[PDB]
Design goal:
Chains A, B: Residues 103-444 form the FAD/NAD(P)-binding domain. The structure is a homodimer of 588-residue chains. The first copy, chain A, is of the alpha/beta class and 588 residues long. The structure holds flavin-adenine dinucleotide (FAD) (2 copies) and ~{N}'-(2-fluorophenyl)-5-methyl-1,2-oxazole-3-carbohydrazide (3 copies).
Chain lengths: 588, 588
């Protein structure tokens, strides 16, 4: 056990020092490497459980059992006297820089996971390159460094959500005594987009600064893995070349799908285009029913838009369907129109986008309802939100041997390793994993530490909490009620639930019984909490802390013995008592 | 053990049925009791692990070991045949109403704890009275049923906090694209007070409806305990009479203190007066530095007021002082003035309150700083927030034998029992307990179940989370950093911390490094989280869920392995890494 860990650690680390905190010979070597600007990992043996056993295993590489011992890319370099000899003789810089490869690590993809992995690897002395290229959308939209979340995802969508939430803050202000008249106030799309894009631009620049300050080589080029250690790159001038690397991390993400119907690619847009659109969309149709579809329809309606959503079957497939129906009912009562049980057949152009006067075009959408009736209506903008997919045929030569599943995602071990031993995959392209930004970041950072600092901790992908940022937000952690019932049986499941009303909604005359929460519990396991669900304001802030308790195995008794904070929405979880089986009403 | 539990349960319950879920004779007795509208507790012996032992112990009370067995106020009434006999002979109603006392329970005080205890007791058949009287403030202010939180505490203060938060929402809305101009909008104090008071009145009415629907006797009268079982009551016509009860719960709360200086009682006010004041306070001095003082100063400033706070020594004594100083620095940067190291000597009247034109008066405040320099300034309103105190000499004859501590609070066992065996105390008057509304509710409900339904569960008063609703909110759960170091020593304490910026503050151009969080941990106990602290928006929603994890013994490793929800403020707790001992900056 200990011998196999040490072997893997030594073969993989770029530069690593084995040390003890109390040793002045170790401190002497540490200070030399700091002066020479040589970054490295450090393993303090006096702070590990079996440090004595490791110290004896080191002799199988160095034939000494003392400390310090310095290694570079699998090779024992020397003890204190030897390292100072290389330093005194101006031979140290050359020894720590010799490698079979151009880089210790090449990351293909500069998004949530890839930037996290590359920066963390560099901190331990791995010579690292990060490659990023943004293929333009069909209408030509492109953006800077940082990935989907930063540029066309979590960041701009939550900022536009906040712009929509402020519409209701303006209405509430009158009831709390402020003198404004909400009915005389309007919204300016282009002013909002300019502020959002200025923030995104500051993130693009901050990531380039961060890579420079960690000595990471940033290449704005398209990468393609042609053999296990060779990456072909093509730059903005179509100059083609090859770089080599010891370890490879694939982190290229996904892009939006289009349906295979006439006019979709030519005349519609996706979320990739929405967040920098230079004109207000006008009367809008959203095709789809994912969290992306509902989040976008929701803020467009709150900004004052005329918005319709076309739903093939159900809302939020894969989420708790009682919660999903309450989400949609709120949206329908607050100005979002729905075309239910309906699909599109073709998009026809009636007017071209007026790019000079900054106005949308006009489109005729034809489709049909599931019974057989026809749909036909005119819209200024049509947004497709019908799923996302990777396109690893762009990234990955089939001769390399990296196995993909039937959806085109990478099949990985529980430590992110592919079927090719030096190649790993993280983020949205790792098959079977939750497709979320904090998951990609944790996977990338934890992987970098295992490769270059001898860490052993794995990423835990179970019970990862989520929040859907619809007009009324929906947070969740764990199983839906229907998945719990299918797994364990109805007689082994107890559900505690309640409506609630935020105190802030009282003076503002908002609804009494629309916010809702529940705990789905397993009777035969001490009433273990299998899933937590909340519909209400600030749902992400409410849910996050409970994710720690669920990770730890919280029971209903743990929620009961914990005391609430008053007045809050979250405290309602500490006093739940009405069960679904009792038939008693959950209203306030 | 079991036999001591059974004797206490039988002696104390008003009406109780010993039963098994599987027994049709028990079902027949349940159905008769429901038809006669006789409320009662039930214990299902087949749901307890020592149910066989309990069934044998019942025989020393009834001389039988079968189920069902019905008891009334410590007396065995009968089995199935006997209960049915009393019913068909119209004898049962008189039997179940036989009592040595007028009531099974008298609650003195109709606030957070007292209303909770009284309603819960009545559910198990306890004949219950709740007494409530509101002694007017020095200027004559009074209010309805529900206690301090409902009328002059948590509820109106958080509603006025929300009105203040909406000021910054109006400012933010411009940056997100909305057409309003914040500089032309003003606030109307009387409109806000009218809305707050209409909500408080709906709560007053709802509590009277709830007591009527639970068959609880509500007496709007002042109560005084004159012997262990006798309560003297004085009504609004000054009629004096005596009622008797088996169990007594003291739940009379506290009221604000005034300093002993000339003019304080005559010309100043307290929080009791603020929340229904018919005119805007105008230019205001708040004397004190408690959470009540800073919350009130904070929202008055956000509503456009000229506000000063006079601080004797420090802010928020008893809270973590690094967090208290950050709370005050934010207020001072956003328009609250502070007179530090200063106390008042006298209040002089310059103008009487203008009741006709609905305007405040004018006052001259004289004081001095700790070095002896003088303070002298004019204000329209002076609010004293210098602590709260019970006044149990008004509630409790000294000859009854209930022991008080040096501060005048009631000394209780861990099951809320006083030194008089049938008398219990809950809420703010229970010595040594956190003075919070959800604590009083849990204590009252749990106590009623122990008295009248044979329950055993105690209230857990440890690590109860809190939130201070200052303009930037401060949430906490567990020990302050200085208390942790005093208890375990500095070398056994590690502190992880970080600044953060809410995403909502980016486009709004608010501050980069004002929000802050830390985890105070114990090294020698697996890095156990001893205390959690957060300064930021929605801090009560952030903190609540983590209180369950801390109750369960969370360590830093539990926070690390839990994944964040993005984009949120709370997710910053899941990736903390900078220690105070490293000296590395917490800025982001
Ligand atoms: C509209 C929307 C909203 C979302 N909201 C949230 C939210 O609120 N919370 C949340 O947790 N998640 C959210 N997500 C999900 C989140 O955006 C993703 O889970 C995350 O971005 C995945 O990170 P990644 O590192 O796997 O890939 P990405 O961030 O997509 O980065 C991959 C990068 O690699 C580049 N690349 C691709 N091929 C190559 C190549 N051959 N050579 C070089 N570079 C290449 C891509 O152009 C891209 O820049 C949202 C997603 C969308 C679409
Ligand atoms: C300004 C302010 C803000 C607060 N904010 C919060 C907050 O945000 N969160 C929180 O958790 N806590 C808050 N608190 C504390 C909370 O109000 C108290 O902890 C809670 O009200 C205590 O409940 P209680 O049942 O002990 O007493 P109370 O609610 O004070 O009820 C006691 C009642 O008994 C009556 N009474 C007294 N003597 C007699 C008698 N002889 N006969 C009959 N009736 C009598 C009193 O008039 C009163 O109606 C706040 C307090 C204040 C002052
Ligand atoms: C807001 C949001 C995003 C997701 C998500 O990313 N993926 N779902 C998923 C879950 C578990 C395993 C595998 C998966 F693919 N869920 O909610
Ligand atoms: C020391 C003390 C005695 C009383 C007194 O008489 N209270 N009775 C009363 C009850 C209800 C409304 C109005 C009332 F006056 N108050 O304080
Ligand atoms: C054991 C213990 C805790 C306390 C106490 O400080 N209670 N009150 C309080 C605290 C924090 C915020 C708001 C509050 F009202 N007294 O004794």
């Amino acid at each position: 056990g200990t011998s196999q860990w040490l072997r893997k650690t030594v073969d993989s680390a770029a530069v690593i020092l084995f040390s003890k905190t109390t040793c002045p010979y170790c401190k002497k070597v540490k200070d030399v490497l700091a002066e020479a600007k040589i970054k490295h990992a450090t393993i303090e043996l006096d702070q590990l459980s079996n440090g004595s056993a490791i110290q004896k295993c080191l002799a199988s590489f160095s034939k000494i059992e003392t400390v310090p011992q310095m290694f570079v890319r699998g090779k024992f370099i020397g003890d204190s006297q030897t390292v100072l000899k290389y330093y005194s003789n101006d031979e140290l810089a050359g020894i720590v820089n010799e490698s079979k490869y151009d880089y210790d690590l090449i990351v293909i993809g500069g998004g949530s996971g890839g930037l996290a992995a590359g920066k963390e690897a560099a901190k331990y002395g791995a010579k690292t390159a990060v490659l990023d290229y943004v293929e333009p959308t069909p209408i030509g939209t492109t953006w800077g460094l940082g990935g989907t979340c930063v540029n066309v995802g979590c960041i701009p969508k939550k900022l536009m959500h906040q712009a929509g939430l402020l519409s209701h803050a303006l209405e509430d202000a009158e009831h709390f005594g402020w003198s404004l008249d909400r009915s005389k106030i309007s919204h300016n799309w282009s002013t909002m987009v300019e502020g959002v894009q200025s923030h995104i631009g500051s993130l693009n620049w901050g990531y380039k600064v961060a890579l420079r300050d960690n000595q990471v080589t940033y290449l704005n080029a398209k990468g393609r893995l042609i053999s296990p250690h060779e990456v072909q790159i093509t730059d903005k001038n179509q100059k083609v070349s090859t770089i080599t690397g010891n370890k490879i991390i694939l982190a290229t993400g996904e892009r939006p799908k289009y349906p295979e119907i006439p006019g979709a690619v030519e005349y519609g847009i996706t979320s990739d285009d929405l967040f920098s659109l230079p004109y207000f969309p006008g009367k809008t149709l959203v095709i789809g029913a994912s969290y992306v579809a509902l989040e976008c329809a929701g803020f467009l309606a709150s900004l004052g838009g005329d918005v319709t959503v076309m739903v093939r079957s159900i809302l939020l497939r894969g989420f708790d369907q009682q919660m999903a129906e309450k989400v949609g009912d709120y949206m329908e009562n607050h100005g979002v129109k729905f075309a239910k049980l309906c699909v599109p057949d073709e998009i026809k152009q009636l007017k071209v986008v007026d790019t000079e006067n900054n106005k949308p075009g006009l489109l005729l959408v034809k489709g049909h309802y599931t019974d057989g009736k026809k749909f036909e209506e005119e819209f200024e903008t049509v947004i497709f939100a019908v799923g996302r997919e990777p396109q690893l045929s762009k990234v990955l030569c089939e001769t390399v041997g990296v196995k993909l599943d039937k959806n085109g995602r990478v099949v990985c071990t529980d430590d992110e390793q592919t079927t090719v031993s030096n190649v790993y995959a993280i983020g949205d392209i790792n098959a079977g994993k939750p497709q979320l930004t904090p998951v990609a970041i944790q996977a990338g950072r934890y992987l970098a530490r295992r490769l270059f600092a001898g860490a052993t901790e794995l990423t835990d992908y179970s019970n990862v909490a989520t929040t859907v940022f619809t007009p009324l937000e929906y947070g969740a952690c764990g199983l839906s009620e229907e998945d719990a019932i299918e797994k364990y049986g109805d007689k082994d499941i107890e559900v505690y639930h309640s409506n609630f009303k935020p105190l802030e909604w009282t003076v503002a005359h908002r609804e009494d019984n629309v916010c809702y929460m529940k705990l789905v519990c397993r009777k035969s396991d001490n009433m273990r909490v299998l899933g937590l669900h909340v519909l209400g304001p600030n749902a992400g802030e409410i849910t996050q802390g409970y994710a720690v308790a669920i990770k730890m195995g919280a029971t209903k008794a743990d929620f009961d013995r914990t005391i609430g904070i008053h007045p809050t929405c979250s405290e309602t979880f500490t006093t739940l008592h009405v069960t679904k089986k009792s038939g008693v009403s959950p209203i306030v």
